[PDB]
Design a protein around this ligand. Structure first.
Ligand code: CL
Ligand code: CL
Ligand code: ZN
Ligand code: ZN
Length: 56
């Protein structure tokens, strides 16, 4: 499935997507991105849109 990431960092914002066999695979992918970009925050998921948000 294709999953989305909304970046709501204090300094750094965007929307990334990733196709992954399951949500856990996509989400580990997306956490790696927030980590490497220097965005650390609270995470929440919206099942109906397959969209994670990270809010710093
Ligand atoms: Cl797919
Ligand atoms: Cl990506
Ligand atoms: Zn897929
Ligand atoms: Zn990626």
């Amino acid at each position: 499935m294709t999953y989305k990431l909304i970046l709501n960092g204090k300094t750094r914002k965007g929307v990334l997507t990733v196709e992954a066999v399951d949500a856990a695979t996509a989400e580990k992918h997306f956490k790696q991105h927030a980590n490497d970009l220097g965005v650390d925050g609270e995470w929440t998921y919206d099942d109906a849109t397959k969209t994670f948000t990270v809010t710093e």
